Amino acid sequence: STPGAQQVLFRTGIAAVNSTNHLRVYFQDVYGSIRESLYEGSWANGTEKNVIGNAKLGSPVAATSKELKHIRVYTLTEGNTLQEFAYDSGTGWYNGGLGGAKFQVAPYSCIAAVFLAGTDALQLRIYAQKPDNTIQEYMWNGDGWKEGTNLGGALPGTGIGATSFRYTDYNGPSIRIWFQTDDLKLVQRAYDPHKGWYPDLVTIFDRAPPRTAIAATSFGAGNSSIYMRIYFVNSDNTIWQVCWDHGKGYHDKGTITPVIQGSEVAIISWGSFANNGPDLRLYFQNGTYISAVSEWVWNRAHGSQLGRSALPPA
Amino acid sequence: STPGAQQVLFRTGIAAVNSTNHLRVYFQDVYGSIRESLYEGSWANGTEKNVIGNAKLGSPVAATSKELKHIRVYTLTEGNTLQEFAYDSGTGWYNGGLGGAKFQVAPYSCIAAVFLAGTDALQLRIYAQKPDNTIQEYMWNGDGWKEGTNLGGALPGTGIGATSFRYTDYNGPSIRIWFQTDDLKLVQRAYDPHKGWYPDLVTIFDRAPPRTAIAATSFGAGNSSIYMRIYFVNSDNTIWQVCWDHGKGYHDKGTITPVIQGSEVAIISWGSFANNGPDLRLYFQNGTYISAVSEWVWNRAHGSQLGRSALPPA
Ligand SMILES: CC(=O)N[C@@H]1[C@@H](O)[C@H](O[C@@H]2O[C@@H](C)[C@@H](O)[C@@H](O)[C@@H]2O)[C@@H](CO)O[C@@H]1O
Ligand SMILES: CC(=O)N[C@@H]1[C@@H](O)[C@H](O[C@@H]2O[C@@H](C)[C@@H](O)[C@@H](O)[C@@H]2O)[C@@H](CO)O[C@@H]1O
Ligand SMILES: CC(=O)N[C@@H]1[C@@H](O)[C@H](O[C@@H]2O[C@@H](C)[C@@H](O)[C@@H](O)[C@@H]2O)[C@@H](CO)O[C@H]1O
Ligand SMILES: CC(=O)N[C@@H]1[C@@H](O)[C@H](O[C@@H]2O[C@@H](C)[C@@H](O)[C@@H](O)[C@@H]2O)[C@@H](CO)O[C@H]1O
Ligand SMILES: C[C@@H]1O[C@@H](O)[C@@H](O)[C@H](O)[C@@H]1O
Ligand SMILES: C[C@@H]1O[C@@H](O)[C@@H](O)[C@H](O)[C@@H]1O
Ligand SMILES: C[C@@H]1O[C@@H](O)[C@@H](O)[C@H](O)[C@@H]1O
Ligand SMILES: C[C@@H]1O[C@@H](O)[C@@H](O)[C@H](O)[C@@H]1O
Ligand SMILES: C[C@@H]1O[C@@H](O)[C@@H](O)[C@H](O)[C@@H]1O
Ligand SMILES: C[C@@H]1O[C@@H](O)[C@@H](O)[C@H](O)[C@@H]1O
Ligand SMILES: C[C@@H]1O[C@@H](O)[C@@H](O)[C@H](O)[C@@H]1O
Ligand SMILES: C[C@@H]1O[C@@H](O)[C@@H](O)[C@H](O)[C@@H]1O
C-alpha cells in the first residue's frame, strides 16, 4: 500500500522544468492542488506541504522556465480562466498577473507555455483553446498580458506542445507548436522572426487518438540548425516520438515507452549532440503503484531507459 | 464535434436505468453538473435544463432503479462524501438522505448501487471504497442509512459493478459484485440469502488495466438459475464482456466494441432467452463527435450492433 502515490490524480496534467540536471516536476493531487517535486542530487518533495496553488480538478498543467531562476506554471481556474503561479529566485512563489486578465477558454482547453529563447528579457507566450475551438496565443512582453496571434481551428480538447529556440545566426526567437486537427492528424505551426507565422500546417502524424497528450522540446540550436522531439500517446497505449534532426528533417517516428490509457506527458532536455548530449527526461503515468508518476531517460552513455520508477510523493 | 457534444465531460462517469425499453442515461458535463438523457420512443434531453444535481469534477456516477418508478443516482461531493439524487414517481427529483450520513470515502473511490430484487420494498445496497482501500457496503432498509458488510481490500480506485437478482425458488435476494484486486485481477464476490457472503473471490479475468471501468447486469432469473454479463475496458482499448450462463458458468469472454482510452461503461438489460430477449444496452465513449456518449445494442433480431451514435445533447 502506497498512500503517497494514491495522492496523485489519475491522469493528472504533468509539466516539468530544469536547469541542466536540476529538475522540477508539477502535477495535480486528488484535491486539485498543484504540487512540486524536485531533483537536486536526488528526488524529494511533492507532498501536501509542497503546494504552489489550486486549480479545477483535471486541469491542464503547463510550465516553462529560465533555468531555475524564473519558473511559471499555468492551470485553469474553476471559472475556466487561465491562471499563473510564478517563482522568482530571491522572491519565491506568488500568484502571477495572468489571472487578473480573465482570459476565458474552452472548459476542455489544454495549455502550452514558453519563454522566448535567446534573451534575458522575460517574454512569455501561452497557447490555449478558445470556446470557438481556435488556438489562441497570449503574450507577455513586460507591460501587461494581451492576446497575440490566433492560430485557427483545432480539435476541441486538443493537446498542445510548444518550444522556443533561437538559431545562433538569427537576430530573434523562433517558436514551434503542435496540436491535433478535426481530421485527427497531428500538425505543426511555425514562427520565424523574418516570416511570422507560416501559413501552412505541416503534418507530423496521420491519425492519433482524440485529445491525445502532446509534449515537445528542442535543443542544440546552431546556425540555421535545430533538433526537436515531439511526443504523444498513440493508440497502442505507448508514448511515441517524432524526431527532427538538422539535415534530416522529420525522419523518424516510433514508440518509446508504455503508459496508462489517457496518460498525460511532459518533456525536458539539456545539452547537445556536439557536446556529449543531449539528455532527455519524460514524465508520465505507466501504472507504477497504480497512480505514481514515472520517468524515462535518454543520455549518451546508455541511451534509452527507464529512470525514477515512482516520483515523490510515492 | 458539435456544441452539444462539447458539453459532455471527456471520460465522464456513465450510468443508466430502464424499464424494459424506457431508458435513462446519466453523465457529467464539463462544469460538474450531472445530467439526464431520456429515451421514450426516441432520444431526448441531456441539456443544461436536464440537470439533476452537481458532483465533484471527475466523480463516479452510479444509478439504480425499480423500473422507472424509483431512481437513485450516486456521486461524490467535493468533500469526498457519498451523495444521492432521488427520483420517486409522483414526487420528482430531490436530494436523497444519503448525503446527510457523511460517509467519507477515498477521493479516487468508485460507486456501484442496487435495489434489492424480488421485493416491493425499497431496499438499497451501495458499494464504494473507504480510505483504507477496502470495499464497504452501505445499506438502506427503510430505517436510515448504515454500514453493511466490508468485503476487503481492492486496488485503489477500482471500478465496481454490481447486480441484484432473486432466484425464483428463494424467498430472498442475491447480490453479485465485481471489482479489481491489488494483483490487478478482476474478481467476483457473492451474496446468497441462505449462505450470506461466500468467503471466496472468484476470478473473472487474470489481469486488467489499472482502475479499468467495470459494469455488470443480470437477467432471466429462474429456479436456481441466472444469466449475467460483466463489462470492462481491456488493454486493447475495447470493452470486453464476461458471460455467466446457466449451466455453463463463466464460459465465454471477448471483445465487444472499441472505446476511447479510459472510457467509463454502463450496462442495462431486460427480458430473457425464454421470451425473445434479452435486450442489452451499453453506453460508453468511442470518440464520436470527440466527446459524445455512444450506444451498443444486443437483441435477438440483430445481435451485436452499434446503436445511437451520439446521445443527446450531441
Ligand atoms: C408519475 C409519472 O408518470 N410521471 C411522469 C414522469 O416520471 C416523467 O419524468 C421523466 O421520467 C422520470 C422517471 C425521470 O427520469 C424524469 O427526469 C423524466 O422527466 C415525465 C416526462 O415524461 O412525465 C410524467 O410527469
Ligand atoms: C416508506 C416511504 O415512502 N419512505 C420514504 C423514503 O423512501 C424516502 O427516502 C428516500 O428514498 C430512500 C429509498 C433512500 O434512497 C433515501 O436515502 C431517500 O432519501 C423519503 C424521502 O425524503 O421519504 C420517505 O421516508
Ligand atoms: C521587469 C520585471 O522584472 N518585472 C516584474 C514582473 O516580471 C513580475 O511579473 C510576473 O512575471 C512575469 C514575467 C509574468 O509571468 C507576470 O504575469 C508575473 O506577474 C511582477 C510580479 O508582480 O513584478 C515585476 O517587477
Ligand atoms: C441456487 C443457488 O443457491 N445456486 C448456488 C449459486 O448461487 C452459487 O454460485 C454463485 O452464483 C453464481 C450465479 C455465480 O456468481 C458463482 O460464481 C457463485 O459462486 C454456488 C456456490 O458455489 O452454489 C449454487 O448452489
Ligand atoms: C538527472 C537524473 O538523471 C538520472 O540520474 C535519473 O536517474 C534521475 O532520476 C534524474 O533524471
Ligand atoms: C527553484 C526553486 O528551488 C527550490 O528552492 C524549491 O523549493 C522551489 O520551490 C523552486 O523549485
Ligand atoms: C514572438 C512573436 O511576438 C509577437 O510579434 C506575436 O504577435 C507573434 O505571435 C509571436 O509570438
Ligand atoms: C525546424 C524547422 O523549421 C522550419 O524550416 C520548418 O519549416 C520545419 O518544418 C521545421 O520546423
Ligand atoms: C536524443 C535521441 O535522438 C535519437 O538518438 C533518438 O533515436 C533517441 O530516441 C533520442 O531522441
Ligand atoms: C431501445 C432502443 O433500441 C434501439 O431501437 C436503439 O436504436 C435505441 O437507441 C434504443 O436503445
Ligand atoms: C442483503 C444483505 O443485507 C444484510 O444482511 C447485509 O449485511 C448483507 O451484507 C447483505 O447486503
Ligand atoms: C445475451 C448475449 O449472450 C451471448 O449470446 C453473448 O454472445 C452476447 O454478446 C450477449 O451477451
The CA distance from B15 to B267, in Å, is 8
The CA distance from A64 to A98, in Å, is 14
Query: Which CA distances in Å does A155 have to A47, A108, A135?
Result: 35, 11, 10
The CA distance from B14 to B61, in Å, is 6
Residue with cell 522540446: A217
User: What own/partner pairs with CB < 8 Å and gap ≥ 24 does A77-81 have?
Assistant: A79/A104, A80/A56, A80/A104, A80/A105, A80/A106, A80/A107, A80/A109, A81/A105
CB A293 within 8 A of CB A285: yes
My answer on whether omega of the bond before A209 falls inside 30° of 0, hence cis, is no
Taking residue A121's Cβ as centre, other Cβ atoms within 10 Å add up to 10
Of B193, B134, B127, B212, the closest CA to residue B162 belongs to B127
Best residue for ligand 11 mutational test, from B126, B139, B166, B189 (most atoms within 8 Å of Cβ): B139
Decide: helix, strand or coil at residue A99. Answer: helix
The CA distance from B234 to B15, in Å, is 19
Q: Is B240 annotated as a binding residue?
A: no
Please answer yes or no on whether B10 and A290 come within 8 Å at the CB atom.
Answer: no
How is residue B90 written as a grid cell? 409522483
The experimental resolution of this structure, in angstroms, equals: 2.2
CB A307 within 8 A of CB A39: no
- Name, in order, each residue with C-beta under 8 angstroms of A44's C-beta and a sequence gap of 6 or more: A37, A38, A312
Give residue A139's identity as a one-letter amino acid code.
M
Please answer yes or no on whether A157 and B290 come within 8 Å at the CB atom.
Answer: yes
Taking residue B131's Cβ as centre, other Cβ atoms within 10 Å add up to 15
CA-based nearest residue in chain B for residue A107: B30
- Name, in order, each residue with C-beta under 8 angstroms of B219's C-beta and a sequence gap of 6 or more: B165, B227, B228, B269, B270, B271, B272, B277, B278
The CA distance from B99 to B88, in Å, is 17
Q: Is B24 annotated as a binding residue?
A: yes
Among residues 81-110 of chain A, which lie with CB inside 8 Å of chain B? 106-108
State the fold for domain B1-314. Neuraminidase (2.120.10)
The CA distance from B63 to B86, in Å, is 10
Burial status of residue A81 (CB atoms within 10 A of its CB: 0-12, 13-18, 19 or more): middle
* Strand ranges inside A20-99, DSSP E: 22-28, 33-39, 43-45, 51-54, 62-66, 70-76, 82-88, 92-95
Residues in chain A: 314
Task: Report DSSP letters for B121-190, one per residue.
Answer: S--EEEEEE-TTSEEEEEEESSS-EEEEEEEEE--TT--EEEEEE--TTSSS-EEEEEEE-TTS-EEEEE
Query: Which CA distances in Å does B9 have to A115, B5, B159, B248?
Result: 31, 9, 18, 39
Query: Which CA distances in Å does A101 have to A81, A97, A139, A144?
Result: 9, 7, 11, 9
H helices of B42-107, in order, are: none
Nearest chain A Cα distance for residue B287, angstroms: 7
Nearest chain A Cα distance for residue B122, angstroms: 34
Nearest chain B Cα distance for residue A274, angstroms: 40
Please answer yes or no on whether A261 and B1 come within 8 Å at the CB atom.
Answer: no
The CA distance from A33 to A45, in Å, is 14
The residue nearest atom 9 of ligand 8, judged by CA position, is: A202
CB B279 within 8 A of CB B271: yes
Chain B contact present for A6, CB below 8 A:
yes
Structure-determination approach:
X-ray
- Name, in order, each residue with C-beta under 8 angstroms of A164's C-beta and a sequence gap of 6 or more: A114, A115, A116, A117, A125, A173, A174, A175, A176, A218
The CA distance from B271 to A135, in Å, is 49
Of A58, A210, A290, the CB nearest to B155: A290
Residue with cell 446457466: B246
Among residues 146-205 of chain A, which lie with CB inside 8 Å of chain B? 155-157, 182
Decide: helix, strand or coil at residue A58. Answer: coil
My answer on whether omega of the bond before A131 falls inside 30° of 0, hence cis, is no
The residue nearest atom 1 of ligand 5, judged by CA position, is: A21
The CA distance from A252 to B233, in Å, is 31
φ, ψ of residue B138 to 5 degrees: the values are: -120, 130
In angstroms, what is the span from residue B118 Cα to ligand 11's centroid? 15
Residue with cell 528526488: A43
